Scaffold this motif. Structure first.
Motif, PDB file in Angstrom:
ATOM      1  N   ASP A  97       2.302  10.352  10.003  1.00 60.53           N
ATOM      2  CA  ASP A  97       2.748  11.396  10.920  1.00 60.53           C
ATOM      3  C   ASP A  97       1.823  11.572  12.088  1.00 60.53           C
ATOM      4  OD1 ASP A  97       4.735  11.749   8.928  1.00 60.53           O
ATOM      5  OD2 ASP A  97       3.598  13.324   7.881  1.00 60.53           O
ATOM      6  N   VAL A  98       0.536  11.304  11.942  1.00 60.80           N
ATOM      7  CA  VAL A  98      -0.455  11.588  12.986  1.00 60.80           C
ATOM      8  C   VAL A  98      -0.982  10.282  13.545  1.00 60.80           C
ATOM      9  CG1 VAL A  98      -2.758  12.617  13.337  1.00 60.80           C
ATOM     10  CG2 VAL A  98      -1.037  13.724  11.806  1.00 60.80           C
ATOM     11  N   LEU A  99      -1.218   9.310  12.676  1.00 59.71           N
ATOM     12  CA  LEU A  99      -1.701   8.027  13.101  1.00 59.71           C
ATOM     13  C   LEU A  99      -0.550   7.011  13.412  1.00 59.71           C
ATOM     14  CD1 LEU A  99      -4.757   7.748  10.691  1.00 59.71           C
ATOM     15  CD2 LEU A  99      -4.627   8.972  12.869  1.00 59.71           C
ATOM     16  N   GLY A 100       0.696   7.325  13.076  1.00 58.64           N
ATOM     17  CA  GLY A 100       1.848   6.521  13.529  1.00 58.64           C
ATOM     18  C   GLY A 100       2.016   5.146  12.881  1.00 58.64           C
ATOM     19  N   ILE A 101       1.403   4.968  11.718  1.00 57.41           N
ATOM     20  CA  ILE A 101       1.561   3.732  10.941  1.00 57.41           C
ATOM     21  C   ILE A 101       2.894   3.826  10.250  1.00 57.41           C
ATOM     22  CG2 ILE A 101       0.756   2.404   8.931  1.00 57.41           C
ATOM     23  CD1 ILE A 101      -2.108   3.562   9.710  1.00 57.41           C
ATOM     24  N   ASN A 102       3.726   2.816  10.428  1.00 54.52           N
ATOM     25  CA  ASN A 102       5.128   2.894   9.952  1.00 54.52           C
ATOM     26  C   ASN A 102       5.136   2.895   8.480  1.00 54.52           C
ATOM     27  OD1 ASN A 102       6.283   0.692  12.567  1.00 54.52           O
ATOM     28  ND2 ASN A 102       6.625   2.900  12.393  1.00 54.52           N
ATOM     29  N   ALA A 103       6.194   3.471   7.902  1.00 55.55           N
ATOM     30  CA  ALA A 103       6.338   3.580   6.498  1.00 55.55           C
ATOM     31  C   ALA A 103       7.294   2.506   5.959  1.00 55.55           C
ATOM     32  CB  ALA A 103       6.837   4.952   6.142  1.00 55.55           C
ATOM     33  N   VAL A 104       7.017   1.931   4.772  1.00 56.78           N
ATOM     34  CA  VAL A 104       8.012   1.030   4.134  1.00 56.78           C
ATOM     35  C   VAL A 104       9.281   1.788   3.755  1.00 56.78           C
ATOM     36  CG1 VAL A 104       6.382  -0.760   3.336  1.00 56.78           C
ATOM     37  CG2 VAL A 104       7.133   1.118   1.761  1.00 56.78           C
TER      38      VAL A 104
ATOM     39  N   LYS B  40       4.000  -3.584  11.622  1.00 54.48           N
ATOM     40  CA  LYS B  40       3.542  -3.566  10.191  1.00 54.48           C
ATOM     41  C   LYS B  40       3.855  -2.242   9.468  1.00 54.48           C
ATOM     42  N   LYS B  41       4.083  -2.295   8.179  1.00 53.47           N
ATOM     43  CA  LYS B  41       4.470  -1.099   7.434  1.00 53.47           C
ATOM     44  C   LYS B  41       3.594  -0.859   6.232  1.00 53.47           C
ATOM     45  CE  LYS B  41       9.350  -1.403   8.620  1.00 53.47           C
ATOM     46  NZ  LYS B  41      10.514  -2.244   8.250  1.00 53.47           N
ATOM     47  N   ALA B  42       3.342   0.414   5.931  1.00 55.88           N
ATOM     48  CA  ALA B  42       2.484   0.811   4.808  1.00 55.88           C
ATOM     49  C   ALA B  42       3.182   1.558   3.770  1.00 55.88           C
ATOM     50  CB  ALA B  42       1.268   1.629   5.280  1.00 55.88           C
ATOM     51  N   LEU B  43       2.662   1.436   2.554  1.00 58.92           N
ATOM     52  CA  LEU B  43       3.049   2.288   1.464  1.00 58.92           C
ATOM     53  C   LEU B  43       1.810   3.060   1.031  1.00 58.92           C
ATOM     54  CD1 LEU B  43       4.979   3.147  -0.830  1.00 58.92           C
ATOM     55  CD2 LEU B  43       4.193   1.173  -2.151  1.00 58.92           C
ATOM     56  N   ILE B  44       1.974   4.344   0.769  1.00 59.57           N
ATOM     57  CA  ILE B  44       0.982   5.212   0.154  1.00 59.57           C
ATOM     58  C   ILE B  44       1.268   5.483  -1.290  1.00 59.57           C
ATOM     59  CG2 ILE B  44      -0.139   7.491   0.168  1.00 59.57           C
ATOM     60  CD1 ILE B  44       0.898   7.848   3.042  1.00 59.57           C
ATOM     61  N   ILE B  45       0.258   5.307  -2.158  1.00 58.48           N
ATOM     62  CA  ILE B  45       0.376   5.590  -3.546  1.00 58.48           C
ATOM     63  C   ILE B  45      -0.775   6.369  -4.097  1.00 58.48           C
ATOM     64  CG2 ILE B  45       1.838   3.573  -3.970  1.00 58.48           C
ATOM     65  CD1 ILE B  45      -0.433   1.984  -4.901  1.00 58.48           C
ATOM     66  N   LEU B  46      -0.426   7.179  -5.063  1.00 56.53           N
ATOM     67  CA  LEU B  46      -1.344   7.883  -5.910  1.00 56.53           C
ATOM     68  C   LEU B  46      -1.301   7.225  -7.285  1.00 56.53           C
ATOM     69  CD1 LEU B  46      -2.936  10.612  -6.248  1.00 56.53           C
ATOM     70  CD2 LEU B  46      -0.793  11.429  -7.094  1.00 56.53           C
ATOM     71  N   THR B  47      -2.480   6.988  -7.889  1.00 53.75           N
ATOM     72  CA  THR B  47      -2.578   6.422  -9.253  1.00 53.75           C
ATOM     73  C   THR B  47      -3.264   7.371 -10.180  1.00 53.75           C
ATOM     74  OG1 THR B  47      -4.615   5.259  -8.663  1.00 53.75           O
ATOM     75  CG2 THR B  47      -2.581   4.024  -8.592  1.00 53.75           C
TER      76      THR B  47
ATOM     77  N   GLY C 290       5.289   9.555   1.196  1.00 55.92           N
ATOM     78  CA  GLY C 290       5.876   9.147   2.426  1.00 55.92           C
ATOM     79  C   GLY C 290       5.585  10.112   3.522  1.00 55.92           C
ATOM     80  N   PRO C 291       6.362  10.017   4.620  1.00 51.87           N
ATOM     81  CA  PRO C 291       6.150  10.944   5.735  1.00 51.87           C
ATOM     82  C   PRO C 291       6.213  12.366   5.267  1.00 51.87           C
ATOM     83  CG  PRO C 291       7.430   9.070   6.497  1.00 51.87           C
ATOM     84  CD  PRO C 291       7.287   8.913   4.995  1.00 51.87           C
ATOM     85  N   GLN C 292       5.393  13.228   5.893  1.00 51.03           N
ATOM     86  CA  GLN C 292       5.441  14.681   5.651  1.00 51.03           C
ATOM     87  C   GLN C 292       5.085  15.094   4.239  1.00 51.03           C
ATOM     88  OE1 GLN C 292       8.320  16.798   7.749  1.00 51.03           O
ATOM     89  NE2 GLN C 292       8.302  15.363   9.462  1.00 51.03           N
ATOM     90  N   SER C 293       4.347  14.230   3.548  1.00 55.55           N
ATOM     91  CA  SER C 293       3.819  14.493   2.235  1.00 55.55           C
ATOM     92  C   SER C 293       2.376  15.033   2.406  1.00 55.55           C
ATOM     93  CB  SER C 293       3.801  13.173   1.430  1.00 55.55           C
ATOM     94  OG  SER C 293       2.841  12.220   1.948  1.00 55.55           O
ATOM     95  N   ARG C 294       1.735  15.327   1.306  1.00 53.23           N
ATOM     96  CA  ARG C 294       0.315  15.740   1.264  1.00 53.23           C
ATOM     97  C   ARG C 294      -0.639  14.653   1.850  1.00 53.23           C
ATOM     98  NH1 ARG C 294      -1.218  16.048  -5.055  1.00 53.23           N
ATOM     99  NH2 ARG C 294      -3.196  16.717  -4.074  1.00 53.23           N
ATOM    100  N   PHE C 295      -0.199  13.393   1.902  1.00 47.60           N
ATOM    101  CA  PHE C 295      -0.980  12.290   2.503  1.00 47.60           C
ATOM    102  C   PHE C 295      -0.393  11.857   3.830  1.00 47.60           C
ATOM    103  CE2 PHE C 295      -1.143  11.683  -2.238  1.00 47.60           C
ATOM    104  CZ  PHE C 295      -2.415  12.254  -2.404  1.00 47.60           C
ATOM    105  N   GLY C 296       0.547  12.660   4.339  1.00 43.82           N
ATOM    106  CA  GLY C 296       1.419  12.316   5.467  1.00 43.82           C
ATOM    107  C   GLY C 296       0.784  11.898   6.751  1.00 43.82           C
TER     108      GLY C 296
ATOM    109  N   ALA D 251       4.649  19.307   7.399  1.00 43.38           N
ATOM    110  CA  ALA D 251       5.569  18.890   8.475  1.00 43.38           C
ATOM    111  C   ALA D 251       4.985  19.058   9.815  1.00 43.38           C
ATOM    112  CB  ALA D 251       6.920  19.640   8.398  1.00 43.38           C
ATOM    113  N   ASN D 252       3.813  19.694   9.936  1.00 41.04           N
ATOM    114  CA  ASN D 252       3.206  20.053  11.233  1.00 41.04           C
ATOM    115  C   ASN D 252       1.682  20.118  11.053  1.00 41.04           C
ATOM    116  OD1 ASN D 252       5.696  20.879  12.892  1.00 41.04           O
ATOM    117  ND2 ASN D 252       5.834  22.371  11.204  1.00 41.04           N
TER     118      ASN D 252
END
Length: 282
Positions: free
Chosen positions: A187-194, A163-170, A177-183, A118-119
């Motif tokens: 959270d830092v680069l400000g790319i919007n989330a789907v 523009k919006k991004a999705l993050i996935i682990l395979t 999503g936000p505030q996750s381990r890939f956050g 979160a920080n």
């Protein structure tokens, strides 16, 4: 919000408190076992290589090969016999080893450099500065922290606000999503989330992906660290092909030796991750 590392200078040592406990840590420790890959990269960036006596060698990623001949203390798996035989004066750990804390702390003082999802940036700066304080290297660590802050601002300035991004682990696909381990992507680069409403992530399928229609898809392929099946193939279907992401070739395969191993405590490794996102979306 994770408790930060705090240190008070008690002569030849520091009294150190972190989220896991209190330690008396000698100044300028000379025999350090490091189990967090990110902070190992920071040791390198501060020129502390000769202080390191043990690293998780089974792990070791391509960007940390200057450490491949350090004695191995494991990889998930910690070898406490090896750690004990080194007679370290300091053990450094992050979130994945907090389960080993009590046993490591019987061997030597054990510093936790956790990354608060979160920080992220305050925890990164505190982790790097606290290490540097041990060695009197605050001035050098502040310079390098500044350099990272400047790289973040360059990456942020070129982000498309619409523009919006999705993050996935395979075969399993899981969304983050936000505030996750890939956050840091959000959270830092400000790319919007789907989905701003998402440590294991949410189970999804190609249908979910099509549903959301992300402009970008950031993929962390955990197969690479372990298989013949990879993300390119799990995503090679007509549903995923329908997305804005597939159409514009913005399915971005991130290096898991950074993202999955979570080397965000590294002065140079964090930089590489920032640049990796920036070069994908510019």
């Amino acid at each position: 919000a994770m408790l930060p590392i705090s240190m008070s200078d008690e002569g030849d040592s520091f009294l150190v408190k972190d989220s896991l406990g209190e330690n008396k840590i000698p100044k300028n420790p000379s025999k350090v076992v490091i189990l967090d890959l990110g902070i190992l990269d920071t040791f390198d960036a501060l020129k502390l290589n000769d202080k390191v006596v043990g690293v998780p060698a089974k792990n070791l990623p391509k960007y940390l090969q200057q450490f491949k001949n350090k004695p191995s203390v494991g990889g998930q798996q910690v070898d406490f016999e090896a750690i004990n035989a080194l007679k370290p004066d300091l053990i450094i750990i992050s979130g994945r080893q907090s389960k080993f804390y009590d046993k490591l702390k019987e061997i030597a003082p054990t510093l936790f450099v956790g990354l608060d999802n979160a920080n992220f940036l305050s925890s990164f700066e505190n982790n790097v500065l606290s290490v540097a304080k041990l060695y009197g290297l605050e001035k050098e660590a502040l310079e390098k922290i500044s350099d990272i802050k400047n790289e973040i601002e360059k990456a942020k300035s070129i982000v498309d606000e619409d523009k919006k991004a999705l993050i996935i682990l395979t075969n399993k696909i899981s969304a983050f999503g936000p505030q996750s381990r890939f956050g840091i992507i959000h959270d830092v680069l400000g790319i919007n989330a789907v989905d701003e409403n998402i440590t294991l992530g949410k189970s999804i399928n190609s249908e979910f992906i099509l549903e959301k229609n992300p402009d970008y898809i950031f993929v962390v392929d955990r197969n690479v660290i372990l298989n013949k099946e990879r993300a390119q193939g799990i995503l090679d279907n007509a549903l995923v092909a329908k997305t804005k992401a597939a159409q514009n070739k913005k399915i971005i395969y991130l290096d898991p030796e950074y993202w999955f191993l979570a080397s965000g405590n590294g002065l140079e490794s964090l930089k590489t991750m920032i640049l990796e996102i920036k070069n994908a979306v510019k």
